[PDB]
Design an enzyme around this catalytic site. Structure first.
Site, short mmCIF file in Angstrom:
data_model
loop_
_atom_site.label_atom_id
_atom_site.label_comp_id
_atom_site.label_asym_id
_atom_site.label_seq_id
_atom_site.Cartn_x
_atom_site.Cartn_y
_atom_site.Cartn_z
N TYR A 1 62.43 53.09 13.03
CA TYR A 1 63.49 52.28 13.66
C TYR A 1 64.89 52.87 13.52
O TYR A 1 65.87 52.14 13.38
CB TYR A 1 63.46 50.84 13.10
CG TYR A 1 62.07 50.22 13.04
CD1 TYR A 1 61.33 50.00 14.20
CD2 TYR A 1 61.50 49.86 11.81
CE1 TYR A 1 60.05 49.43 14.14
CE2 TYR A 1 60.22 49.28 11.74
CZ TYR A 1 59.50 49.07 12.91
OH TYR A 1 58.22 48.50 12.87
N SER B 1 57.46 46.70 5.54
CA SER B 1 56.69 46.70 6.78
C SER B 1 56.13 48.10 7.08
O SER B 1 55.32 48.62 6.30
CB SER B 1 57.54 46.15 7.92
OG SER B 1 56.73 45.77 9.02
N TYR B 2 56.58 48.72 8.19
CA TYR B 2 56.17 50.09 8.53
C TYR B 2 56.62 51.09 7.44
O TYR B 2 55.92 52.06 7.15
CB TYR B 2 56.71 50.49 9.90
CG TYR B 2 55.93 51.59 10.62
CD1 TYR B 2 56.10 52.94 10.28
CD2 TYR B 2 55.05 51.28 11.66
CE1 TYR B 2 55.40 53.95 10.95
CE2 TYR B 2 54.35 52.29 12.34
CZ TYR B 2 54.52 53.62 11.98
OH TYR B 2 53.82 54.62 12.66
N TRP C 1 55.17 43.74 18.94
CA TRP C 1 55.55 45.02 18.36
C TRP C 1 55.65 46.12 19.43
O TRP C 1 56.63 46.87 19.46
CB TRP C 1 54.58 45.44 17.26
CG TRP C 1 55.10 46.62 16.49
CD1 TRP C 1 56.21 46.66 15.67
CD2 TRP C 1 54.54 47.95 16.47
NE1 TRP C 1 56.37 47.92 15.14
CE2 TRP C 1 55.36 48.73 15.61
CE3 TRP C 1 53.43 48.54 17.07
CZ2 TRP C 1 55.10 50.08 15.35
CZ3 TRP C 1 53.17 49.88 16.82
CH2 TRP C 1 54.01 50.63 15.96
N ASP D 1 53.67 35.76 5.60
CA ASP D 1 53.82 37.08 6.17
C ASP D 1 52.48 37.56 6.69
O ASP D 1 51.46 37.44 6.00
CB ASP D 1 54.38 38.04 5.13
CG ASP D 1 54.62 39.43 5.68
OD1 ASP D 1 55.63 39.61 6.39
OD2 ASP D 1 53.84 40.35 5.36
N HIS E 1 57.57 37.32 8.20
CA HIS E 1 58.01 38.70 8.40
C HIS E 1 59.45 38.80 8.85
O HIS E 1 60.14 39.72 8.46
CB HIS E 1 57.10 39.43 9.39
CG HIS E 1 57.00 40.91 9.12
ND1 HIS E 1 56.37 41.42 8.00
CD2 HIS E 1 57.43 41.97 9.83
CE1 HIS E 1 56.41 42.74 8.04
NE2 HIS E 1 57.05 43.10 9.14
C1 DBC Z 1 56.90 46.40 10.45
O1 DBC Z 1 58.00 47.36 10.50
O2 DBC Z 1 56.86 45.34 11.52
C2 DBC Z 1 55.61 45.41 12.19
C3 DBC Z 1 55.06 44.01 12.37
S1 DBC Z 1 53.62 44.04 13.46
C4 DBC Z 1 54.72 46.28 11.34
C5 DBC Z 1 53.80 47.19 12.15
S2 DBC Z 1 52.72 48.25 11.14
O3 DBC Z 1 55.61 47.08 10.57
#
Ligand code: DBC
Ligand code: DBC
Ligand code: CL
Ligand code: CL
Ligand code: CL
Ligand code: CL
Ligand code: CL
Ligand code: CL
Ligand code: CL
Ligand code: CL
Ligand code: CL
Ligand code: CL
Ligand code: CL
Ligand code: CL
Ligand code: CL
Ligand code: CL
Ligand code: CL
Ligand code: CL
Lengths: 573, 573
Positions: B43, B116-117, B165, B258, B286
């Site tokens: 991002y 997250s990612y 996403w 989450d 999230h």
């Molecule tokens: C995060 O950065 O937000 C997304 C929610 S689906 C996830 C994807 S692996 O990672």
């Protein structure tokens, strides 16, 4: 190397009085001196993430060759001295700007940006006439502290803003303490309890008794609670009159549901003739910039557009600090999120040119009490002299729901009003269901013909968009405390039963009421804890015990002889 | 100078295949080499504010003498190459870590952190066995992409997560484009339309037809929609089996609402015997870390405590990257926000030691359909063989309300369930009103005896806390797609009318049901768009047209011979 920078922490800057303030320096790798941006922050210069998501991706400014200076205000965190809100910020800003101007790395052009307190400090900086200060960008801010956020144009105390903020500062004063104390742990917990129940904390009478807050931050009583009039103690910190004298460009950001909206917009109007002023207004409250609320979603385009704001600020500073005369080509003077159609729209001025300030008169057959009363709104003067009457009881005030709430449920500006519709002290007046859209974009006010059984009381007005599904969404509102009907400075009581014509300043909005909707107005005498409750006695409201207070039989007059109305800024485009 | 640092932008790091990835270096002013932290970000590494408020005040790490490296992942923003989710991250992380290890400014100790990612990439980094990687801190993440976020333990597609996403990535691919294109402006608007109406976008059948998303990011169909089984294409990117082999310390953060909670917790359980594992779980979804929701407030203590998280991470990295053996003294192994009492609490392990996995049996006189049916929950086996029956119609699925929603209304985890209570396909079973508190803290599951008129169908279960005021607050839920009842890998259909005993994995929660409340369970056959709707045909669900799909008469069996129950992790302390 372009893109690259260094950061120096806790550089100590001396003020005229010898007290030293701490700053961090974000300086680009550069040959020569650079343009510089200053941010004055009461919430820890180190903690950049807490405020910046409300402002700009400002590291971009540093990668593009601006220095950024972030300062701890007097008496907080790494800075020396004693913290008292507002009173030192003019002189401390001026001293800071001179120090920046004197540095090897400053090219003699200085700007400012920031939100809320970081916005108020910019007007305080701008009134010092320091030549090197070329531009400011005050976001969600005010140039008159009485009118925002502590009191308002109606002369009622913003009790929820006051307690919430004081609790927040209190919590900071503790977590950061010079020498930690035994009472700290328990005090911390008590301040949390205020923040978890602001309405509860505001309910304790006398309001002026604040054992915890008054001890932690004496200013809460000494300045705010003890000075209900717009007296010299307020004007002393007010910047507003001096703004007409200025020629400083200002990039001004506001939110329709933000506690400062009224005053942010006023600052734009006051500076726009003398210098390049810009305005941006989204559908945000002070703590909710998402465009998402419990019963109202504005779409992802409404989400505070942080990258576009960054580009806009950069263009603005490039024009005024770097002399790049075409930097703001294609950039509108005014940008507004128009609710209803829920779309960003460019405008050439604020107020919009071609605004038709249109009276909508209160009418209807029989009592207007409740949402199922017979209250109407119409562009025609009402046929017959009627009056709606209710009892206002300070012990049971109309609860605040959305609007420009700051700390007490301040994340739900466009609140559904249905929970308070069946109450007898909420008078409702609505139009027929609309078959054509009606754009209302501008400042909004009410003229009401009123009477009271008491020698003082409040009157409130709230503009509401009624959706076909039933949702009655708040848009803007205001209050007049009757002692302050004519002036905020020299109040006088009223005679019981005498009819008065009063103005209610309802701030501003931008909404298209779509076909299928109605335009509605709620009239009452309280809106708590957005505003503190009027005691109905003529006393010093904040020093009164609940049991000491009176109820009031209040009355709204409507008809040909008493044409009570809301004035709506109609746009037809 | 201690506290001071410099930032180098766009340092280009080569991978084994010759493609170069861009990083920014935040390096402390120091004599020698330093410990280094890596963050791998899809991002935009420049845009630090977007993710960091969910993570740590990490500039503090830099002021305390860590270097921080932030990388654009392959094919995004300043990085070269082509972006495809997940598939390159193992090798790109490994190559990046070697490059860091080789630098003058790296002392041979490397850690990772992020949400997250930025959390998933850490497990991908950790499985490469690079010796210099000493610790990870994956927040709101998964080590098995099938189980989170794309499908789940029940074998249903998380359609809202997928579309939301993909739309978000699509929007990034555009705003950042190499050479801007004519279709960009309109595509951008269409992706916004998906994000403003995820349920609407998920409603279009066949699901597998995605002209816009499939073109922008082919992976959406090629990988996710085309692979409904947990097949080798999934296991190929799954890290989970390899985790038992590892000896890497992990600071693991999760939220009760989450999307990744189930899988975050599993990663803790898988690593805790081999290395120092830490767990922190707050009441967050999230996209909502505030502790505030439409109908549920957890108090300011519930707000993601960013400064305390920073201190905790610093202590963690100080222990494992700096060899400071006492750095984690006084820091608990497990920290949980216990809802109901709404308080943070320390624990010695997860699952809690002394967990009593307790059956609560479904019962009641007459139909359990709706919240005003007669469905009960009891610790005693039900007296009499009954069955509740309903019609599940794919054209009218039970709408998703709160839970672990990611993009479609993902900011209201503890959602009030009253809007769906009067429906006939929502079966309700509740306890009497409690006179003693009941703590439920741990993993949660259901065993249901079920039958269907169809050869495939879904069954859902949702744990609900019913408040005295009427609010029925969601806590945790799950689904089983019947073809996947025994295995996620080799599905088989079912015989119409035959009774099956199925497990439903309902993830986990921590809640004290207080006196005055009830424990409730909602059973149904859909939860849309959290999960895509089962077609009730045995077909390839994502390739089916709505008109092609069947309704199903579904049945829940309860009594002595078919003792259907929820298993609750009871804590008594
Ligand atoms: C995060 O950065 O937000 C997304 C929610 S689906 C996830 C994807 S692996 O990672
Ligand atoms: C901003 O930082 O938040 C406060 C809301 S009352 C305000 C005080 S001047 O500044
Ligand atoms: Cl220097
Ligand atoms: Cl001082
Ligand atoms: Cl809406
Ligand atoms: Cl728009
Ligand atoms: Cl106009
Ligand atoms: Cl009507
Ligand atoms: Cl009378
Ligand atoms: Cl008169
Ligand atoms: Cl170098
Ligand atoms: Cl590539
Ligand atoms: Cl609550
Ligand atoms: Cl707590
Ligand atoms: Cl235990
Ligand atoms: Cl009962
Ligand atoms: Cl039958
Ligand atoms: Cl059987």
């Amino acid at each position: 190397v372009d893109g690259n920078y260094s950061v120096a922490s806790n550089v100590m800057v001396p003020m005229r009085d010898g007290v030293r303030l701490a700053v961090d320096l974000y300086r680009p790798d550069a040959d020569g001196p650079v343009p510089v941006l200053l941010v004055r922050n009461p919430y820890d210069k180190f903690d950049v993430f807490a405020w910046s998501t409300q402002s700009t991706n400002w590291l971009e400014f540093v990668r593009d060759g601006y220095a950024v200076v972030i300062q701890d205000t007097r008496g907080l965190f790494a800075s020396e001295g004693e913290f008292v809100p507002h009173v030192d910020d003019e002189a401390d800003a001026e001293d800071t700007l001179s120090w920046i101007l004197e540095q090897a790395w400053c090219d003699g052009n200085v700007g400012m940006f920031g939100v809320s307190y970081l916005g108020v400090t910019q007007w305080q900086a701008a009134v010092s006439g320091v030549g090197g200060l070329k531009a400011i960008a005050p976001s969600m801010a005010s140039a008159d502290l009485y009118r925002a956020p502590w009191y308002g144009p109606g002369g009622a105390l913003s009790v929820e803003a006051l307690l919430g903020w004081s609790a927040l500062i209190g919590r900071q004063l503790i977590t950061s303490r010079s020498d930690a104390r035994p009472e700290d742990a328990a005090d911390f917990v008590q301040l949390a309890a205020i923040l978890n129940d602001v309405a509860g904390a505001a309910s304790v009478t006398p309001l002026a008794e604040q054992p915890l807050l008054g001890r932690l931050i004496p200013w809460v009583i000494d300045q705010v609670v003890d000075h209900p009039d717009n007296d010299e103690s307020w004007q002393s910190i007010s910047l507003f009159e001096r703004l007409g004298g200025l020629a400083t460009p200002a990039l001004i950001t506001a939110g329709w549901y933000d506690g400062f909206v009224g005053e942010s917009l006023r600052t734009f109007v006051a500076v726009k003739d003398n210098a390049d002023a810009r305005l941006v207004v989204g559908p945000w409250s002070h703590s909710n910039l998402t465009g998402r609320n419990a019963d109202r979603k504005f779409g992802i385009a409404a989400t505070y557009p942080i990258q576009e704001a960054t580009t806009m600020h950069k263009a603005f500073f490039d024009r005024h600090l770097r002399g790049e005369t075409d930097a703001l080509a294609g950039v509108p003077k005014v940008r507004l999120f128009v609710m209803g159609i829920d779309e960003w729209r460019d405008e050439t001025d604020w107020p919009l040119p071609d605004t038709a300030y249109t009276p909508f008169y209160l009418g209807g057959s029989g009592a207007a009490n409740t949402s199922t009363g017979g209250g109407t709104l119409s562009t025609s003067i009402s046929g017959t002299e009627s009056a709606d009457t209710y009892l206002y009881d300070p012990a049971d005030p109309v609860p605040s729901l959305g609007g420009t709430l700051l700390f007490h449920n301040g994340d739900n500006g466009p609140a559904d009003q249905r929970p308070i519709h069946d109450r007898d002290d909420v008078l409702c007046y609505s139009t027929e269901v609309l078959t054509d859209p009606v754009e209302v974009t501008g400042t909004v006010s009410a003229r009401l013909f009123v009477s009271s059984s008491a020698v003082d009381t409040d009157f409130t007005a709230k503009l509401v968009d009624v959706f076909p599904d039933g949702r009655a969404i708040a848009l803007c509102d205001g209050i007049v405390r009757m002692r302050y009907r004519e002036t905020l400075v020299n109040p006088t009581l009223i005679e019981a039963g005498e009819i008065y014509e009063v103005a209610i300043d309802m701030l501003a909005t931008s909404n298209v009421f779509l076909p299928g909707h109605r335009i509605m107005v709620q009239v009452s005498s309280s809106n708590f804890p957005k505003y503190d409750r009027n005691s109905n006695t003529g006393g010093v409201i904040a020093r009164e015990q609940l049991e000491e207070m009176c109820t009031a039989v209040n009355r709204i007059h409507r008809g040909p002889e008493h044409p009570s109305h809301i004035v709506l800024p109609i746009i037809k485009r």
